Amino acid sequence: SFVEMVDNLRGKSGQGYYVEMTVGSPPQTLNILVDTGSSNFAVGAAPHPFLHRYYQRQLSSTYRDLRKGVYVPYTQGKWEGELGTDLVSIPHGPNVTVRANIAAITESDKFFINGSNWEGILGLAYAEIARPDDSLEPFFDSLVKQTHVPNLFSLQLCGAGGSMIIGGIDHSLYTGSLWYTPIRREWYYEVIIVRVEINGQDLKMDCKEYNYDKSIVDSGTTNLRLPKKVFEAAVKSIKAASSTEKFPDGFWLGEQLVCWQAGTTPWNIFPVISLYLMGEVTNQSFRITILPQQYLRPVEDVATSQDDCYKFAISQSSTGTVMGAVIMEGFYVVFDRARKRIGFAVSACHVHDEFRTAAVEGPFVTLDMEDCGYN
């Protein structure tokens, strides 16, 4: 039941969101990062300073060794492992157990994070981007093939963890309309941005620029990441809007804190960002609106806790647009694989203050008939 799956996520935008899973027989419990930006299921399978626990294959009587290796480099971080299959379940997910491919991680570099509380990663994207290649069936594909569970899941990520609902839409997790954008190609969850506004002002670029290389929805990435040209325009607009405030050297590069007296963060001087996504009907679109409460990521540190401190959670990308966790937060996002579309609605934990709120609004119509896809 969906009600049983509500609030089955913990974690952060910055260090990711994780769900409890089990692997092996008898079941070994692990926390697993939920990642719509990759397609491998991999778990720590050897001791590591940052691992609280790990998959012990010798204690699983249902483990099968595939006698093959696998290497996965992400944008940051990488791991190497041995492939096998074993029985996998999600205690606070669907009431099923399936046999799935598992990469047992034996070596890693800057993959595991100190204090994150997860021990593996669940890549929920498509086989096309699986390593070593597309012949390695991803977990969700195995889940759908071996059970009767409908081919879709939804994510409700919440900031200061959320819910992953597998097999259907939980109407209790959103208000207002659910708006759908097509999945352009089934590899990453690739979508098309047709228009960008910052505080109501159109950036006025050829819309292909917004999707340069590609645009994807990626729960495993913290920031909104933008192609260079779009990033520079965004920073220009946000800097102009917040000009009454002085920001530290390096703030706009995303690795320097800015702090304000507790409760006094000047939210109002930062603009809202609107991303218009391609609709299901020709030249119609809808927008999701992003508040500074989203793109200024709070950095919890007891040492700095006399004040409220933030990092700028928009970054320049070399890999195309990435709608990461800070974008997904506050929205109910439906990965409707069966109908090749992604839905957005306002969730119960959407960000807002007394003047402004995150929103999903449509339809909007565009005159120009250009295809905004880059490829």
Residues designated as active site: 35, 218
CB 284 within 8 A of CB 182: no
Contact 27, 90 (CB under 8 A): no
Least separation, in Å, of the C-beta of 220 and ligand 0GS?
3
Closest listed residue to residue 363, CA positions, set 270, 295, 267, 287: 287
- Token pair listed for 16: 């990711």
Decide if 276 contacts 364 (C-beta within 8 A): yes
Strands (E), 74-223: 78-89, 97-109, 120-123, 153-157, 162-166, 174-182, 190-191, 193-198, 201-202, 215-217
H/E stretch holding 43 reads strand 41-44
What count of other Cβ atoms lies within 10 Å of the Cβ of residue 25?
Answer: 14
Least distance CB 260 / ligand 0GS (angstroms): 27
Total of residues contacting ligand 0GS (CB under 6 A): 18
Amino acid at the residue 280: E
Tell the smallest beta-carbon distance from residue 72 to ligand 0GS (Å).
Answer: 5
Closest to ligand 0GS by CB, 114 vs 264, is 114
**Which residues in the 55-74 window bind ligand 0GS by CB under 6 A?**
72, 74
Nearest residue relative to ligand 0GS (C-beta): 77
**Terminal C-alpha separation, the chain:** 40
Q: How far is the CB of 187 from ligand 0GS (least distance, A)?
A: 9
Closer by beta carbon to ligand 0GS, 189 or else 310: 189
Per-residue mark of binding to ligand 0GS, 18-57 (x: CB under 6 A):
---------------x-x-xxx------------------
Please, which of residues 131-190 interact with ligand 0GS by CB under 6 A? none
Q: Do the beta carbons of residue 140 and residue 323 sit within 8 Å?
A: no
Decide: is 317 part of the binding site for ligand 0GS (CB under 6 A): no
For 118, counting Cβ atoms within 10 Å of its Cβ (0-12 exposed, 13-18 middle, 19+ buried), the class is: buried
Q: Which of 1, 49, 58, 76 binds ligand 0GS (CB under 6 A)?
A: 76
How far is the C-alpha of 184 from the C-alpha of 159, rounded, in Å?
A: 28
Indicate the SS3 state at residue 269. helix
Tell me which amino acid residue 215 is.
S
Residues 327, 294: contact at Cβ < 8 Å? yes
Sign of torsion over alpha carbons 271, 341, 142, 71: negative
Show the binding pattern over residues 81-110: x = contacts ligand 0GS (CB under 6 A), - = does not. ------------------------------
From 41, 111, 179, 344, residue interacting with ligand 0GS (rule: CB under 6 A): 111
Q: Is residue 259 a contact residue for ligand 0GS (CB under 6 A)?
A: no
Q: Does 329 bind ligand 0GS (CB under 6 A)?
A: no
Q: Which is nearer to ligand 0GS, 33 or 144 (CB)?
A: 33
Least separation, in Å, of the C-beta of 253 and ligand 0GS?
16
- Residue 75 in the binding site for ligand 0GS (CB under 6 A): yes
Shortest spacing between CB 228 and ligand 0GS, in angstroms? 17
φ and ψ at residue 22, rounded to 5 degrees = -125, 150
For ligand 0GS, the binding residue among 22, 221, 285, 317 (CB under 6 A) is 221
Exactly one of 6, 66, 96, 113 binds ligand 0GS (CB under 6 A); that residue is 113
Tell me which residues touch ligand 0GS (CB under 6 A). Answer: 15-16, 33, 35, 37-39, 72, 74-77, 111, 113, 129, 218, 220-221
